[PDB]
Coordinates of C-alpha atoms (C1' of nucleotides) in Angstrom, one line a residue:
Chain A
X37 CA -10.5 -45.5 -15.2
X38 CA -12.8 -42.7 -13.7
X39 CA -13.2 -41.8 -10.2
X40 CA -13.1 -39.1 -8.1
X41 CA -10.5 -37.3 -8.9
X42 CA -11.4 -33.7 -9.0
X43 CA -12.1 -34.2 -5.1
X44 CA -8.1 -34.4 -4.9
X45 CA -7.4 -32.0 -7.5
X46 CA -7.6 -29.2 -5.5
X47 CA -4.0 -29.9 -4.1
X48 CA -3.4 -31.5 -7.0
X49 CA -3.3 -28.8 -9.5
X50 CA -4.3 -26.4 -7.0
X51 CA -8.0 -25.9 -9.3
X52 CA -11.0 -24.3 -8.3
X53 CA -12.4 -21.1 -9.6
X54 CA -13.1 -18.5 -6.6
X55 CA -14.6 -15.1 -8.5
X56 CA -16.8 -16.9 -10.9
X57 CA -19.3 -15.2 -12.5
X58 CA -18.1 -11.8 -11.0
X59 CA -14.6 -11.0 -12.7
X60 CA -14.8 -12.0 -16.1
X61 CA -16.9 -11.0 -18.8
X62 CA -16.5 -7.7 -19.8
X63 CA -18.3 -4.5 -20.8
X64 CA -15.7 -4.2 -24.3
X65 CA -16.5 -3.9 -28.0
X66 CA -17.8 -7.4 -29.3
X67 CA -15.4 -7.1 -32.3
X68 CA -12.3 -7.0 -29.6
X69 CA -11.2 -10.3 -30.2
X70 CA -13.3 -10.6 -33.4
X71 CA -10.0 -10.9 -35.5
X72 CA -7.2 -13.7 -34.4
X73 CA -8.0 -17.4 -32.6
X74 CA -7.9 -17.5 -28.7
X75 CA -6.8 -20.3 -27.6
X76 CA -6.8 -21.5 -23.8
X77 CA -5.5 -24.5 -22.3
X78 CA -5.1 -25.5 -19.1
X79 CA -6.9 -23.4 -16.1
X80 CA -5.6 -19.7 -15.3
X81 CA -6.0 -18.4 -12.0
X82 CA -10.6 -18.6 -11.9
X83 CA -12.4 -19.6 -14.9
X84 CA -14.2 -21.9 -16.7
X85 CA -13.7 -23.7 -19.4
X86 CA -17.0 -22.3 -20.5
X87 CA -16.8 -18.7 -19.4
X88 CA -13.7 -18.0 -21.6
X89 CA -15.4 -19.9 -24.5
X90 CA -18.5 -17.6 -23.9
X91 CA -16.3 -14.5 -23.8
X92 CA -14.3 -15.2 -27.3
X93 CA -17.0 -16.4 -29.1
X94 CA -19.3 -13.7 -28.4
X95 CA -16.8 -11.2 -29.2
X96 CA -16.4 -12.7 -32.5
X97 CA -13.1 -14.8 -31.5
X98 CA -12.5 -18.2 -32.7
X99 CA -12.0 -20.6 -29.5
X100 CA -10.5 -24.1 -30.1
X101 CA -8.0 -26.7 -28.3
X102 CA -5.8 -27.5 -31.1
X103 CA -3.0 -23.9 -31.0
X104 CA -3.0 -22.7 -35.0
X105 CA -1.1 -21.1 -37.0
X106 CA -3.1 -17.5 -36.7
X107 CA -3.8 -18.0 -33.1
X108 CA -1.1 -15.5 -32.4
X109 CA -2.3 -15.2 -28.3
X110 CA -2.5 -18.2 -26.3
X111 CA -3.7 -18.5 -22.8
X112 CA -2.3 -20.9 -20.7
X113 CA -2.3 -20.4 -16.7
X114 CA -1.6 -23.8 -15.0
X115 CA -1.0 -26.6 -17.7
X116 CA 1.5 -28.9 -18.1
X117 CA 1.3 -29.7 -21.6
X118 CA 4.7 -29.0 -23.0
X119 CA 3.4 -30.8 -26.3
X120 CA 0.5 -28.1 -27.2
X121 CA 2.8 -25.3 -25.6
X122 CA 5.7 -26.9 -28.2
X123 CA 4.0 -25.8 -31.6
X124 CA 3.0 -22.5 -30.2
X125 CA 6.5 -21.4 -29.2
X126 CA 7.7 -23.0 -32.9
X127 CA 4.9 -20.5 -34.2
X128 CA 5.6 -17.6 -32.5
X129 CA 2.6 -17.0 -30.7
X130 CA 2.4 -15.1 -27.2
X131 CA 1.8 -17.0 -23.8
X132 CA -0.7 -14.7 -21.8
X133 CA -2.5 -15.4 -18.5
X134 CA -6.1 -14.8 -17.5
X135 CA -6.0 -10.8 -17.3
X136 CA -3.9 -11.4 -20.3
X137 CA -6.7 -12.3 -22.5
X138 CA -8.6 -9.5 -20.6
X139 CA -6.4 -6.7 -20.9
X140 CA -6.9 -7.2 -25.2
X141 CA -10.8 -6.2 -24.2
X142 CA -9.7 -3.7 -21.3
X143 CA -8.0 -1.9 -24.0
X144 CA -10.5 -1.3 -26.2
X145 CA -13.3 -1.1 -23.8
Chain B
dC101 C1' 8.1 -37.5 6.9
dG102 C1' 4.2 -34.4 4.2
dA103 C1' 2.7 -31.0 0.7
dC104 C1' 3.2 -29.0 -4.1
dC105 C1' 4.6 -27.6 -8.6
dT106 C1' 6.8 -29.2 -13.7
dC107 C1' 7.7 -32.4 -17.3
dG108 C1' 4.5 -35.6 -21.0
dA109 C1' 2.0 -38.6 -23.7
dG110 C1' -2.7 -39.6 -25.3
dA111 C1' -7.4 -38.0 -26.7
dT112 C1' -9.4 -33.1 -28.8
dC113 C1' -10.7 -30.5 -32.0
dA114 C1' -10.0 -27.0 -36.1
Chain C
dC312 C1' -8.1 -31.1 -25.0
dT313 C1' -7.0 -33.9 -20.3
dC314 C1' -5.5 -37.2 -17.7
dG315 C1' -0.1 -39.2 -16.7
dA316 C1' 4.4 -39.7 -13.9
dG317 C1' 7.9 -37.5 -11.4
dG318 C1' 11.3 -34.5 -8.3
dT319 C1' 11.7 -30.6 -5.0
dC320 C1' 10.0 -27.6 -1.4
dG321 C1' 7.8 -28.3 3.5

DNA sequence: CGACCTCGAGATCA
DNA sequence: CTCGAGGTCG
């Protein structure tokens, strides 16, 4: 069942993150999202999986793949599962992108 | 006739 | 979370 498939994915799912290392990870206050759950899914437009985990936890934020009841903000760039996406929308919680989730620190600063 | 983006169900993890 | 199958733009 495994091969290699992310060689493909690129057209696939049009993945690969271009500004790695160089974009993300802010300069705001570490309590920013030390409050409600970020959750991401998916792949926004260049991150890891990793560096977004890095950036909510150390600002205090809880990071998991199961949406919650007080995640309230959930990040989803290109994803497909309507299933995840499903309980959010029920919930009420907010569909924001990459900046999205950025923009929360940005604010603050 | 070739490239590309959306639904979807099964493992993932609080 | 992370592959899974499809229909439309090209």
């Amino acid at each position: 069942k495994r091969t290699n498939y992310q060689a493909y994915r690129s057209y696939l799912n049009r993945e690969g993150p271009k500004a790695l290392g160089s974009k993300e990870i802010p300069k705001g206050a570490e309590n920013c999202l030390e409050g409600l759950i970020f959750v991401i899914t998916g792949v926004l437009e260049s991150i890891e999986r990793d560096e977004a985990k890095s950036l909510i936890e150390r600002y205090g934020g809880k990071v998991t793949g199961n949406v919650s009841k007080k995640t309230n903000y959930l990040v989803m760039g290109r994803d497909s599962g309507q299933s995840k996406s499903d309980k959010a929308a029920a919930l009420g919680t907010k569909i924001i992108d990459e900046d999205g989730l950025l923009n929360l620190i940005r604010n603050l600063e």
